[PDB]
Amino acid sequence: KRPVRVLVNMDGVLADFESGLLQGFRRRFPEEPHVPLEQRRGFLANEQYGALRPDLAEKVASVYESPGFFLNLEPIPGALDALREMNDMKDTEVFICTTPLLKYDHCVGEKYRWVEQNLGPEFVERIILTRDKTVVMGDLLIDDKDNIQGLEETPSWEHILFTCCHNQHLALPPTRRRLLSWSDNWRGIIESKRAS
Amino acid sequence: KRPVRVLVNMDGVLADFESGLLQGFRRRFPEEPHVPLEQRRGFLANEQYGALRPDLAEKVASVYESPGFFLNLEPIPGALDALREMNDMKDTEVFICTTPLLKYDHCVGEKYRWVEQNLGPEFVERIILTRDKTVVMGDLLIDDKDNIQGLEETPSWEHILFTCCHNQHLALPPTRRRLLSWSDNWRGIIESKRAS
Ligand SMILES: Nc1nc2c(ncn2[C@H]2C[C@H](O)[C@@H](COP(=O)(O)O)O2)c(=O)[nH]1
Ligand SMILES: Nc1nc2c(ncn2[C@H]2C[C@H](O)[C@@H](COP(=O)(O)O)O2)c(=O)[nH]1
Numbered sequence: 001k002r003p004v005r006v007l008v009n010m011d012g013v014l015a016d017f018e019s020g021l022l023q024g025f026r027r028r029f030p031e032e033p034h035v036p037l038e039q040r041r042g043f044l045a046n047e048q049y050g051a052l053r054p055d056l057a058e059k060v061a062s063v064y065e066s067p068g069f070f071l072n073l074e075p076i077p078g079a080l081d082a083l084r085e086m087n088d089m090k091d092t093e094v095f096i097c098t099t100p101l102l103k104y105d106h107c108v109g110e111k112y113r114w115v116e117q118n119l120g121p122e123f124v125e126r127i128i129l130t131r132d133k134t135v136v137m138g139d140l141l142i143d144d145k146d147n148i149q150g151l152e153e154t155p156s157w158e159h160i161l162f163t164c165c166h167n168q169h170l171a172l173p174p175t176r177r178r179l180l181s182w183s184d185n186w187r188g189i190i191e192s193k194r195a196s
Numbered sequence: 197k198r199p200v201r202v203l204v205n206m207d208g209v210l211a212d213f214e215s216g217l218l219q220g221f222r223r224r225f226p227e228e229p230h231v232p233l234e235q236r237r238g239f240l241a242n243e244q245y246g247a248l249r250p251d252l253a254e255k256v257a258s259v260y261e262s263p264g265f266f267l268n269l270e271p272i273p274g275a276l277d278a279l280r281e282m283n284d285m286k287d288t289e290v291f292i293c294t295t296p297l298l299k300y301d302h303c304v305g306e307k308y309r310w311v312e313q314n315l316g317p318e319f320v321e322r323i324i325l326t327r328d329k330t331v332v333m334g335d336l337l338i339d340d341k342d343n344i345q346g347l348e349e350t351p352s353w354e355h356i357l358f359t360c361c362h363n364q365h366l367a368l369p370p371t372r373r374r375l376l377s378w379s380d381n382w383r384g385i386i387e388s389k390r391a392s
């Protein structure tokens with residue numbers, strides 16, 4: 001009876017943060033070692049760059065902390081079509097659920113404008129900003145972060161791992177479901193939740 | 197056993213939106229009719245000003261849509277002391293839960309900076325921005341809005357009505373609890389929830 005509610009993450013799922021960070025890094029520090037997308041491992045890019053050479057952590061962070069960085073991210077392939085499709089499904093409710101940087105200054109505002117410009121004013125109404133996704137109530141959370149924790153020990157949602165460069169090689173127990181891309185069958189996953 | 201989680205609203209509860217709007221209106225439109233705080237009725241100020249005279253709705257909105265308006269709000273009396281006290285209580289979890297304007301441009305960013313400057317970086321981590329509070333999981337919601345609705349028919353929280361100029365004369369059924377101000381016994385209300 002109930003509609004199925006789907007929480008959809010922003011960076012790594014709708015907005016291509018990883019491609020935008022690499023392109024920004026190579027343009028600004030053309031002389032420096034970089035991490036090709038295929039070689040990304042672990043959720044935080046600055047930690048990987050820092051393991052390469054300590055000062056590069058600060059350098060890569062200066063890219064995502066710049067004015068215009070979040071504003072100008074390109075969409076993830078197929079994301080805008082899929083989210084429009086999903087939003088029009090009957091008895092289906094969509095929210096966009098995103099964690100801003102602690103350096104919020106050029107992040108929070110740019111994220112609202114990104115959604116307005118790439119999706120539309122109607123989607124702006126459905127943004128939730130939070131540093132703890134476990135306190136948001138939904139049936140599914142589609143998110144590229146490997147392991148999501150916070151104050152609620154047993155969240156109401158099932159986490160569906162959205163495949164991204166940094167989690168592609170990650171081994172998951174059979175109980176954890178993945179979405180390989182927006183061409184994978186996210187429609188069937190929604191139906192599995194309705195059925196329970 | 198569980199900690200008690202308290203969602204605390206921003207405008208009308210921590211930040212004095214109503215006093216800041218009136219002061220801004222009288223300074224910018226000194227020649228126009230105004231609504232004294234004591235005479236405020238109903239949640240939306242622009243609707244009341246619009247009922248006074250149609251063009252005044254647009255004029256009052258121009259105040260809260262200005263750069264610097266959210267940034268510079270004064271705190272509600274006793275709010276900063278009480279939220280610090282509450283946050284240090286054992287087995288008690290606090291989040292700040294706020295709805296931004298659909299005209300987000302000078303609202304979203306200013307709200308983050310308000311919390312940093314009036315409360316501290318630690319409180320910035322606990323902001324949730326949403327247009328639907330019913331999908332946020334907590335035990336209590338302390339909020340000045342008369343009636344809170346959204347997609348979840350039976351929210352997990354009990355709404356505690358925080359008294360404000362615009363809701364002071366509102367008659368509520370005996371089942372609805374009010375907080376008269378931050379000098380009223382919010383500590384006992386938290387204990388009532390722990391007990392269940
Ligand atoms: N500190 C830090 N934050 C990062 C890094 N990469 C991405 N982020 C932040 C940027 C976004 O605001 C936030 C996205 O979180 P999420 O909503 O779970 O996709 O993650 C990084 O390398 N270091
Ligand atoms: N459109 C409109 N919005 C208002 C008015 N007064 C306050 N607001 C908005 C400003 C805040 O972003 C939002 C606060 O909602 P809340 O989180 O429930 O306290 O309410 C008004 O008169 N008209």
Ligand SMILES: [Mg+2]
Binds near residue numbers: 145
């Ligand atoms: Mg993400």
Ligand SMILES: [Mg+2]
Binds near residue numbers: 339340
């Ligand atoms: Mg309020």
